[PDB]
């Protein structure tokens, strides 16, 4: 939000505007990283991005705690090297790399396609980057009718999300990631759990309209009374929501699950690739942006 608008205070107290990404620009499938570079915390570009420019921008705007994304500032170097074929030290070249399928990215995700998500030909490869709203449709779905839902519910729609993934992937792509997706899983409570319940540590609730403007605008939920989490929130509660998202009875089973889909995960780690490996061509459409309505500098 634009400085003398009200918006923010006194969570965050030096905002700055909405800038819809321009067809230039640099965007990656992640609905957290793009928020942040539409409103200038890190290059509105999304080029040249360091990890001290990450860490302050996700403590100082979002309310998430530098432990919250150690291994995703690991991984995002190690994808950025395999990308490029060579060291990026201290400067992620770009927001787009992060894309490069079956590495950080993942398949069955909440709101994004897959790689080759229903394609005819097994060369063929789309937009896993951009914010696809029938996709996002599949995930809310699940919890239609309702304004808020739990780690039963979660568990629910990312079941749902690998069910439709296995059986529109081509035949042989299909890489289930409980790990990571189950972070991002972990990610949603962190950010847009109701913290004007009482039990909101215990039982984190999302609320289903933040959930929704977040990612469908790429920008923050302000006007829906929503702040950043305070204190800053911890990796600690991001590993244990995302156990407990898979431990979580499940009381309807998609058909075509693949093999040991319910059931723990194992511990997220760092990714490690091949010097002799070729990375997979990323999709290069342009940015997504909120045109239905356009957002103005204050949403
Ligand atoms: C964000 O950053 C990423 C990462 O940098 C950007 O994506 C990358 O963008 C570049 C363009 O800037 C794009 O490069 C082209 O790739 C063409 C296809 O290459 C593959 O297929 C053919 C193989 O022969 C080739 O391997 C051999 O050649 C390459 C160099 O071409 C060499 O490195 C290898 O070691 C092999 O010897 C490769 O596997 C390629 O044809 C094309 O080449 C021409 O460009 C100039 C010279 O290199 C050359 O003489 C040619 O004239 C060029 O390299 C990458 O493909 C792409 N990477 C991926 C993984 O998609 C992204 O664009 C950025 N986006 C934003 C929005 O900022
Ligand atoms: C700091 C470094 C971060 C990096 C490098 C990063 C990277 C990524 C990548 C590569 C994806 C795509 C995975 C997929 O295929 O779904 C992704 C997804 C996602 N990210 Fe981030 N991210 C970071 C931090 C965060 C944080 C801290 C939040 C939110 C509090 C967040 C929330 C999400 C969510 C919810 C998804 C899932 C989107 C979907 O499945 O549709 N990210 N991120
Ligand atoms: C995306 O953002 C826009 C702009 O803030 C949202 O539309 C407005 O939403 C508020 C409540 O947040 C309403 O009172 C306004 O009247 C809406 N304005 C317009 C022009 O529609 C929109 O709802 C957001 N999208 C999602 C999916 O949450
Ligand atoms: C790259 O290639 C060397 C041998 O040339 C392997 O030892 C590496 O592990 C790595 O191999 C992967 O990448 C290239 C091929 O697709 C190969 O199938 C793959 O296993
Ligand atoms: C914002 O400003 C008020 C006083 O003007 C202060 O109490 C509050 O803690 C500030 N918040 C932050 C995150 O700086
Ligand atoms: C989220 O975190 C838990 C605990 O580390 C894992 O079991 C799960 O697979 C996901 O990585
Ligand atoms: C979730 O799990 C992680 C390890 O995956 C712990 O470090 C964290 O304290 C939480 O229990
Ligand atoms: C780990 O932390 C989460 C979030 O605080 C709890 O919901 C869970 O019960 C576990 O104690
Ligand atoms: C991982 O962590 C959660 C935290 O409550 C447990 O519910 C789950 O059973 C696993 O131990
Ligand atoms: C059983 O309960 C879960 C949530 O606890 C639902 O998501 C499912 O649809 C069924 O009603
Ligand atoms: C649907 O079926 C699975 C096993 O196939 C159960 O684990 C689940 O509880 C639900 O009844
Ligand atoms: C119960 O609910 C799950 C998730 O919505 C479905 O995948 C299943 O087919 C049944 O409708
Ligand atoms: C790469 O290809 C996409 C569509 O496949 C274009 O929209 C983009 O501009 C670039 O040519
Ligand atoms: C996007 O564009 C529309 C129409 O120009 C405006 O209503 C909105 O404020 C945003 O600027
Ligand atoms: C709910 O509790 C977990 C599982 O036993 C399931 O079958 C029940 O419906
Ligand atoms: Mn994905």
């Avoid at 819809?20 to 915390?41: F, I, Q, V």
């Avoid at 229903?118 to 919890?143: K, P, Y």
């Avoid at 749902?160 to 189950?182: C, H």
């Avoid at 009381?251 to 040991?260: E, F, M, N, R």
């Amino acid at each position: 939000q634009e400085p003398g608008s009200g918006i923010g205070y006194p969570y965050d107290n030096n905002t700055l505007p909405y800038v819809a990404p321009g067809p230039t620009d640099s965007r990656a499938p992640c609905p957290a990283l793009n928020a942040l570079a539409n409103h200038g915390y890190i290059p509105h570009d999304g080029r040249a991005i360091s990890r001290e420019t990450l860490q302050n921008a996700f403590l100082n705007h979002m309310g998430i705690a530098n432990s919250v994304i150690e291994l995703a500032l690991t991984n995002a170097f190690v994808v950025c090297e395999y990308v490029t074929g060579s060291d990026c030290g201290d400067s992620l070249v770009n927001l787009t790399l992060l894309a490069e399928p079956h590495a950080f990215e993942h398949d069955h995700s909440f709101s994004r396609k897959d790689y080759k998500q229903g394609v005819a030909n097994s060369n063929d490869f789309i937009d896993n980057r951009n914010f696809d709203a029938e996709t996002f449709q599949t995930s809310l779905d699940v919890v239609a009718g309702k304004t808020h839902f739990d780690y039963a519910d979660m568990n629910e729609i990312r079941l749902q999300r690998e069910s439709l993934s296995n059986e529109l992937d081509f035949p042989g792509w299909f890489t289930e990631s409980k790990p990571i997706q189950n972070v991002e899983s972990g990610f949603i409570f962190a950010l847009v759990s109701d913290f004007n319940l009482p039990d909101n540590d215990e039982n984190p609730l999302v609320r289903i309209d933040w959930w929704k403007y977040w990612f469908t605008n790429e920008s923050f939920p302000y006007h829906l009374g929503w702040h950043p989490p305070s204190p800053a929130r911890e990796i600690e509660f991001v590993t244990s929501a995302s156990s407990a998202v898979l431990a979580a009875s499940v009381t309807s089973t998609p058909s075509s699950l693949p093999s040991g889909a319910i059931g723990p995960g194992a511990e997220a780690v760092p990714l490690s690739f091949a010097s002799t490996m070729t990375p997979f061509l990323l999709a290069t459409n342009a940015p997504y942006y909120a045109q239905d309505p356009t957002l103005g500098p204050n949403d």
